Amino acid sequence: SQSQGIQQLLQAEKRAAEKVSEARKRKNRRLKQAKEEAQAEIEQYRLQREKEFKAKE
């Protein structure tokens, strides 16, 4: 009888914690990838500014 409800409550909190923990890990991974892609574009800008400065000189 009551054991089914006990299991449903415990498993409900476990299911919630899993989906939220995986989505929080995904969020942090996406923000890290945003910073990495940003730095790649920032290096390309720096390199272009250097090439232009050499040409001006």
Place this chain on the structure above:
Amino acid sequence: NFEKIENELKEINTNQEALKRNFLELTELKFILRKTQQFRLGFVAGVINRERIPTFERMLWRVCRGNVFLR
């Protein structure tokens, strides 16, 4: 002396009533905790006279649209 007795009785009666109420409420809480300890969700817990349970449970299943877990 009359004031002493009067004030003692008033104070002691007031305190006896309050303490007896608190004692009975904590007695209910002892049982409530012992049963509840067997078990983002939310919950509430309490005590009622048994004769109200049929109407109480049916109203929970009526106010919530068929969805409530009760023990």
